[PDB]
Each structure stands twice: as C-alpha cells, then as structure tokens.
Recover the amino acids of this structure.
C-alpha cells in the first residue's frame, strides 16, 4: 500500500497562506511546536513528543574487547529505525534512501562533535572496555523526524547511568546497584539539530514544518550547533539553491532555538532528578492523564484462588486411563528396526530381476 | 495470587486507524492497526483477508525467537476475526516493546486485542492473556515478575476466549506434570474474569 | 552473525588440524576397474521426478520439479547444487560457497545439451541435487542422478548424460586412474571429469585442471573417460526400465 | 581540589552507601521511633533510676563514647564503673554493615569535618548519649 | 595472643602488661571484635554454647595487619 495523494486545492491554499505569512496550526514563523518529555523507570529511556511526533530512545552498555588499535577508548554504535506503524509508507526494506541520510546526519552530529567522553570508558587496555549502544525508534510520523530524534538521543544519553567496577592490582570485580551505586556519564556539550524549509524558490522560510508543509516545499536546510556559539554540522539538501546572507540568518536562528531547547532540556532533567530523589513515584504508569476519557486505572485484585485444587482433582479422576495394547518392535538386521503394522516379507529381494 | 496495577490508553497516535497502549505494572507494549486496505496481488486471497503481525524489540534486532512468537500472535488473532466479510484486503498488526518487566506475551496479547477493538474490526469474541509461574515447590503465582521468573522452575502463558473461557494459545517454559497444568489452567480461567471486567469498564468509560 | 539461524560460537577450529594421527598411505590398485553401482529411480513421492545414486562411498539425492510459470520460444533450465554439511572432513557454512556455484554452473552447462527446451515456451524447469556423503568423485554423480531424474519426470530429451572421473598419480611415472576415492583424490595432482552421450556419441561437458602438461596424456584421460561412460550405460539402462515397469503397473 | 587529593591519595572512600546497604536500618521514624522491647528489659538490668550517669565531652561531640559513674553504697565504700556503648545489635555477622566496617577500619578525621565509619544517622542519633533517652550500653562494675 | 609468647604481650610505654581499647566500638574496628568477644565471655560462663563461630588465627592476624596499615 501507499499513502494518500495530495490534491490541487490544498497546495493552492497552503501557498496562499505562506504568501500571507499565516500557518495552519496558528504558530508564527519562528516557532516550535511545544515539547513534552517522559522518563521510564530504569535509566536511559525516554519518550519525547514534538507536536504529534513520537520517538523512543533507549541507551544500553556492554563490556567487550577493544578491537586492534585505539586501545584506550570505547566504541559507540547507533541505529535509527523507522517503525512500519509510524506511517503507511514505511515498509521494512522499501524506504532505503531516507534511512541513510538520517543515520548519517545523526552519526556525524553526535560522533564528530566530540561531546561524549569516550576517553574515560576503559578498565584495562587491550582488555575489556565498555561498548555503549544508542537505539532510537520512530513511532508516529508528523514531520521533522530529526529534531525529535536528536532531542531524544540527547536526553537518553544525559539520563543513562553505567554499572561500576573496582580495579586494583591486576584483578577485576563487577558490582550491582545494591553492592555499588550506578555512575553517571561525562557530557561536554549539547549538540541540537535545527531544520529550515524553503518555499517557492527561497523567497520565504518556515521554522519547524509539519507533514503537509513538508510536501509543499522545495528543499530543506539543517544546521546542527551545540550550546555557546559553536556550529557542529550543516547539510543543505532537497531541491534548494541558496544565497549567502541566508545561511548566516539561518545560523542565527538555530543559535536562538538551540539556546531555548537546551534551557527546556536542562529544566526537565532537573525536575526528574528532584522527583527521583524526594522519594515519590515515577515511571511510565504515573504519567497517564487521569482527566481524560481514554484512560482507566485498576489496583491489584486477588481473584479467588480458592477452587483450583478441587476442579483439577475431579478432572484428573474423571477421564479414561491409558489403554494397554502394547506394540512390538521387529528386528531386521542390526541397524534397522520397525514398529507398526509391519511389512509382509523380511525384505525385498529380486523383486523385479 | 493477585494481578498487579493495570492501565491503558486509547487513540494516542493520529496517523494509524486505531492505537492502544497497555501497560500492566512496569512492563508496557504499544500497538497500532491500519484498517482494511489494499494488498499486494501476489499475497491476496479470495473470500478471506490476510493478517500480518510483526514484533519489534527494544534492544537489538528481531531474530528466530521474535518470529516464532509472531506466528502465535497471528494464529491467535486469526481465530477471532471475521475475515470472510472483507476479502481481497489486508489487516496488519504491529507491536512495539517499550519496557520489559516480566510476562510480556500476555501484555502483548492484551495490547493487540485493545488495538483491534479500537480500530473497529469485526470480531467474533475477545481474547485475553494470563501468565502463570509456579515456584520450585508448587506455590502458584499469577502475573509474575522477572525476579520471580528467574527463580521459578516453570512459566506458562495462556490465551483465553471471552465466551466460554476456552484455550486458544499455549506456550510453556520449564518441565512439570499435568496436575499443576490443570490447576494453573483453572487459575487462568479465574483470572480472565477480571480482565474482561477491565475491558468492559474501559469501553463504558470511553463512550461516556 | 546471522539473524535467520541459531547462533553458537563465533569461531570453531575442528580437531583435524589438531589430529595427532599422521596421514596414512592410500595403497595401490588396478586402474581398469569401476566401483559397483546401485541406482534407484522414482524415490520421492511429493516430487515429479527423483532418483538416488549410490556407488561405494558416494550418496547423492536428486529431485526434479515440474514446469512452472515464467530465448522465449524456449524455456529456462534452473539448477541448484548443495551438499549436506555433515559431508567430508570438515563442516561447511550453510549459506553457500563459490565451489557450489561452480558445480551448479558445471551442471547447467552440461544438462542443457540434452533436453529440448523448444517444447516448453515461457515455462521453466528446476533441478535440485543434494550430496549426502562425499566419498569420491562427486561431479560424476550429480550428472548421472540429475539426468536420471529428468528422464523419470516425463520431460522430453534427446538422450541421457553419463559422467565419469579420473585422477593423476603423484609418482615419478604418473598414470591416470578411473573412479578415484578421497584416499586417491587428495594425494593426486590433477583430475578430469567427462560427460558423454552414449548413443549420439557427443561430449556434453569437460572440466580438468592440474599439473599434467603434455598433450598426450589428456588424450588418454579423455578416451578412457569415454570408455567409462560407455561402460556405465547398461545399469542406467535397466534402472529406468524397472522404474517405468513399476510405475505403470501401479495404475 | 586539595582535600579531594588528600582523600584519593591516602586511600579513603567518600561514597555514600547503596540501597540494600542502607535499607537494613533501624527505623527511627516519627510515627514509630525506637523503644526497647520488654523481654530485653527483663533480660538486661536497668539502672536508669538508682544511679547517676553523665559525661564531659569535647566541643562539638555529636557522638559520645565515654561515660562513668561512682557512688557510695549502704556500707561506705566507693564503687567504680565505666560504661561504654554496646553497639553490637545493629551489626549482625556476615552483614553488609559488617563487611563495610571491616573495610573502613578506622574513622578518619581531617580538621574541618569527621567521616562516620558507619552510615550517618545509625550512630549520629541512635548511639550517642544525648538528651536522656534510652540507650543500650555495657556497664562494667 | 597465643600466636606469640607472653613476653610479647606487654604495654611497657604505660608500665602495664596488657592494654587495648574497648571505649570505641564506633570509630574503629578492633573494638567491635572486643565487643563480640566480651559479650561471648559474659554469655559463655553459663555452661552453654555460642552458636556462630568467631574468628581464627590467620583471620585475626590479617585483620590486625590491615588495621595497622589503615
């Protein structure tokens, strides 16, 4: 199956809007759709919602032997993924020219910026070191997959907490959250992606576009830039043909937006740590809105486990015992034996000769 | 024996036809369904529809185990969906594992059932998921946790009808005798009576 | 590693490379002898045509599927060669191998000169061969069996295909041998396999590589291969006769 | 930074404990604080009425060890006794607090703060002779 | 103790012949040893048995070397 086609009335209406500098959902040009984060119970797991998009991030680490060369660092996998349920079009092996540009954007940003400290993830050299592995999934496609994926990866990496080890002399030991407290990571900076869309041959631009606005646009400009004033990647793409003042304007815009987004992320992580430290209840369950028609909650229930013995006993007692015709095995010659109705002759011989 | 905290939310995502997140305690599973749509000519069947079930884990990539547990989920939904009313079309079920804390298959079956119900698919009868885990001595525990699952000598999971409480699907781990298989089946039959009440109360609240 | 199979150890060195028993001595024989062969046709019940060929230490099973949908004006002849992992000194990777593709092409370029594809427009035939045990010349068995299977599957052919095999001794006075075994094949310098049509007297396939460089030994290797393919024919003559006598009388 | 260097170098730990190493705690909660189960009042021999116990202690002594008491009896002689806190009831053998104590052999003192060998409320309310609340001890006599 | 001779038991600097601490079970480690042992002593002169073992020679000597280090 494919996705519904685009009519010729919506295109005209969207372009009349864009000309008039008014958007569908009311938000003006330099705005984001507001954000809403939610944390799991075990560390390094979050659900970010930008507008109506969803991404699931989950970090996980493991101890391996560090290849050959680079004997004093650790490796860092990544794996974006697009879930068949995100949108009709996504198909497990039929959208192979978006996955590549997305994985590349994500990896170049996160791994070339050098914000994670992969220096201090060794135990010995030439021997076991930690191998982290980020994982993202797209749940609901409504445009701007990469801003949400980047914020998700950031939060998931800034909420993880490793295991921890004791090393002295030439001897290892591995603890557990009851034997020793999990340990945080070291994060230099916060690289946060921003996207721009261009409309009718660069004459207008719109920040943070959604999926209809994504189908009425010429090309896209992405500018990934960590906090302070330091750019980390740019990738023009789509169908665009650019000037030189516009890249600078865009860089300013991305500066502002990454400032605001980092503000938000820091505040949310702080609130989450405060909640976890007070001693209250946390998790995916205690996030479900209760003021809403589509939610229902039920505490525990002993059902009545008073009768199962009797029923099982009568059932076992009330049925026919195994019968008693026992079969015999036949021996032809050591190596082959037969059981069943058998064959008339011992074996065939000169049947046709 | 006591089932733990239950919660459910419906119509989360705007793109699919019906969505339903079902979390029972700490573990959670999200599901969505696309209604009867077009199907590839090489896979279509006349006088019937075609059910497609794919399962995605949270860490790693699916292997032999996830397809072996995908057959069970597809062959369980195939026995309660009236496909003859919709031939030459396709019905697809997608399951995403968000968090794991024990008894994942039962929560997946309940997520699939609530997604099919929300999506508006003709159904013959509802189905449930109940998991039993008897300990090293014989003390039955219902809806266990991976802490108890690790210590337990046998774990059993059942899918039960909503009409006469028959047995639809059965996947068992560990070795046991038939007597406690009967007593855990009876415990499952006693447990489904509360899940179906949770179903009815949730849909009664939805249409308030 | 593989996401469609059961994963075990990443690496596994077989104990032959640690086998402390030194390689033995093959022995000697008469180079004018053939290993006795027993052939059976029509084995499988769910297959359109099948045959099982066994001679000495070689066990090969071949089955032929019927024409299916999809040089047209002519039908294709797909081929597939695959040998059981529990065959030979060491294990083999299930996914495949370049040697298997080489033998598959040596089969396709040898069974097409026999069948007449100008009678199956827009159709195709599929031939599958499996080697249960490798105890000698293999390509001399994947040809005889895959030719018996085709004739037993009711497809129209000009003639059969009968294969043979040879190997070269490593001594100071080398001599070609007929029907070599693994004890006479791993100690050899070169090997040759011929595919002769016994009635049309036309060579269908030829393959040979090694250390024999004089263009007077290969003439003998070829013509004793032709004598072997002219000596294997009667057994295959009575095998299809028995196969049709039994198949027809069952109605 | 200098204090941290002195710690790391001289082999002293500054890590607060974990959940299961903490949780095995005496519950000094306001809704139910600590008070002696009467069979142990039988089994012991109270002196909170018939004898006087006090202590001089250094400035800042949030945690007292030393106590004594000398009175006269119905004859005229001077009974002597030194009373040391009996902290053995909250460290069970092969525990986590006992392995912990076995590791941190000696409480370390640098001249701003202390560093409790134990968790920081097990003795710094429950073991220190303060106030005039009940407190298990050992009185040689 | 009896791992060594009597002559090696004295407290010459204080003119005693045996001297340890018992006034600090909280800020040290030999004192919890002394607590367990002193209570074993007050508990043993009744003709019963103190279930649960206490120590051994090598254990005590490695502990005392550890405490010297610390």
């Amino acid at each position: 199956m494919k996705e519904t086609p685009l009519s010729n009335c919506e295109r005209r209406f969207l372009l009349r809007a864009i000309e008039e500098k008014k958007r569908l959902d009311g938000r003006q040009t330099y705005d984001y759709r507001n954000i809403r984060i939610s944390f799991g119970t075990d560390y390094g797991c979050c659900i970010v919602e930008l507008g109506k998009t969803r991404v699931l991030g989950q970090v996980s680490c493991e101890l391996v032997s560090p290849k050959l060369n680079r004997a004093t660092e650790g490796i860092l996998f990544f794996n974006l993924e697009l879930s068949q349920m995100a949108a009709p079009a996504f198909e497990p092996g039929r959208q192979s020219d978006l996955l590549v540009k997305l994985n590349r954007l994500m990896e170049r940003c996160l791994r070339n910026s050098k914000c994670i400290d992969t220096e201090s993830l060794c135990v010995v050299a030439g021997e076991k070191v930690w191998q982290i592995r980020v994982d993202l999934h797209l749940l609901n496609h409504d445009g701007n997959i990469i801003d949400a994926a980047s914020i998700a990866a950031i939060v998931a990496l800034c909420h993880f907490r490793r295991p921890d080890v004791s090393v002295q002399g030439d001897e290892v030991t591995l603890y557990t959250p009851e034997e020793r407290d999990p340990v945080p990571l070291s994060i230099h900076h916060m690289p946060i992606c921003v996207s721009f869309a261009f409309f009718q041959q660069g004459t207008y631009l719109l920040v943070d576009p959604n999926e209809r606005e994504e189908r009425v646009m010429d090309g896209l400009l992405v500018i990934a830039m960590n906090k302070h004033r330091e750019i980390c990647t740019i990738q023009s793409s789509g169908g665009i043909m650019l000037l030189k003042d516009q890249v600078l304007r865009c860089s300013k815009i991305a500066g502002v937006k990454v400032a605001e987004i980092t503000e938000l992320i820091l505040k949310a992580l702080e609130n989450d740590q405060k909640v976890r430290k007070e001693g209250g209840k946390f998790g995916f369950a205690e996030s479900i809105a209760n003021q809403r028609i589509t939610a229902f909650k039920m505490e525990k229930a002993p059902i009545d486990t008073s009768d199962v013995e009797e029923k099982a006993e009568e059932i076992i007692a009330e049925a026919e015992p195994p019968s008693e015709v026992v079969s015999t095995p036949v021996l032809w010659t050591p190596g082959t034996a037969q059981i069943g109705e058998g064959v008339e002759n011992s074996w065939g011989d000169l049947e046709d000769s | 024996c006591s089932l733990r905290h239950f919660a459910c939310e419906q119509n989360l995502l705007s793109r699919p036809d019906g969505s339903a997140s079902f979390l029972q305690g700490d573990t959670s599973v999200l599901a969505g369904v696309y209604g009867p749509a077009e199907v590839k000519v090489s896979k279509e069947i006349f006088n019937k529809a075609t059910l497609e079930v794919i399962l995605r884990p949270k860490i790693g990539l699916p292997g032999v185990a996830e397809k072996s547990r995908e057959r069970l989920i597809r062959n369980t939904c195939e026995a309660v969906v009236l496909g003859t009313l919709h031939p030459r079309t396709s019905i697809t079920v997608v399951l995403q594992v968000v968090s794991d804390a024990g008894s994942l298959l039962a929560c997946c079956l309940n997520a699939a059932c609530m997604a099919l119900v929300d999506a508006g698919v003709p159904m013959r009868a509802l189905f449930c998921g109940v998991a039993c885990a008897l300990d090293s001595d014989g003390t039955l525990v219902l809806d266990p946790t991976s802490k108890q699952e690790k210590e337990a000598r046998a774990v059993l999971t059942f899918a039960l009808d909503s009409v006469e409480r028959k047995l639809l699907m059965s996947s068992t781990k560990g070795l046991y005798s038939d007597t406690e298989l009967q007593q855990c089946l009876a415990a499952a039959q006693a447990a489904s009576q509360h899940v179906f009440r949770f179903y009815r109360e949730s849909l009664q609240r939805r249409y308030s | 590693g593989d996401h469609r199979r059961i994963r075990g150890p990443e690496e596994s060195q077989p104990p032959q490379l640690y086998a402390a028993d030194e390689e033995e001595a093959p022995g000697t024989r008469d180079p004018t002898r053939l290993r006795p062969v027993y052939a059976r046709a029509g084995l499988l019940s769910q297959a359109k045509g099948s045959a099982y060929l066994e001679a000495g230490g070689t066990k090969v099973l071949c089955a032929v599927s019927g024409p299916r949908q999809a040089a047209a004006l002519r039908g294709r002849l797909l081929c597939d060669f695959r040998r059981a992992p529990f065959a030979g000194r060491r294990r083999r990777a299930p996914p495949g191998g370049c040697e298997e593709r080489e033998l598959a092409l040596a089969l396709q370029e040898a069974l097409e000169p026999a069948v007449r594809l100008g009678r199956y427009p827009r159709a195709q035939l599929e031939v599958s061969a499996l080697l249960l045990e490798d105890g000698g010349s293999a390509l001399a068995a994947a040809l005889t069996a895959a030719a018996l299977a085709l004739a037993d599957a009711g497809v129209e052919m000009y003639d059969l295909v009968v294969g043979c095999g040879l190997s070269l001794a490593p001594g100071p006075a080398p001599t070609w041998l007929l029907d070599p075994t693994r004890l006479e094949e791993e100690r050899a310098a070169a090997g040759l396999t011929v595919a002769l049509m016994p009635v049309l007297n036309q060579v269908a396939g030829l393959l040979g590589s090694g250390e024999g460089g004089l263009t007077e030994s290969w003439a003998e290797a070829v013509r004793l291969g032709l004598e072997g393919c002219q000596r294997l024919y009667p057994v295959l003559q009575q095998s299809l006769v028995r196969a049709a006598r039994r198949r027809g009388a069952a109605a | 930074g200098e204090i941290a260097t002195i710690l790391v170098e001289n082999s002293i730990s500054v890590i607060p404990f974990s959940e299961a190493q903490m949780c095995e705690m005496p519950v000094n909660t306001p809704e139910s604080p600590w008070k002696v189960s009467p069979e142990e009042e039988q089994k012991r021999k109270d002196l909170r009425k018939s004898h006087l116990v006090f202590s001089i202690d250094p400035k800042g002594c949030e945690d007292v060890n030393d106590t004594l008491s000398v009175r006269t009896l119905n004859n005229g002689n001077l009974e002597l006794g030194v009373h040391i806190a009996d902290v053995t009831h909250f460290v069970a053998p092969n525990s986590y607090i006992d392995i912990e104590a076995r590791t941190r052999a000696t409480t370390y003192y640098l001249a701003d703060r202390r560093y409790d060998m134990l968790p920081s409320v097990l003795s710094a309310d429950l073991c220190s002779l303060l106030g005039g609340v009940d407190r298990y001890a050992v009185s040689i006599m | 103790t009896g791992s060594c001779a009597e002559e090696e038991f004295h407290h010459y600097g204080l003119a005693l012949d045996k001297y340890t601490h018992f006034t600090s079970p909280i800020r040290r480690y030999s004192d919890i040893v002394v607590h367990r042992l002193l209570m074993a002593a007050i508990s043993k002169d009744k003709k019963m048995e103190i279930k649960g073992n206490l120590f051994s020679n090598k254990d005590l000597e490695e502990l005392c070397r550890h405490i010297n280090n610390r």
In short: Residues 245-278 of chain A form the longest helix (34 residues). The radius of gyration of chain A is 31 Å.
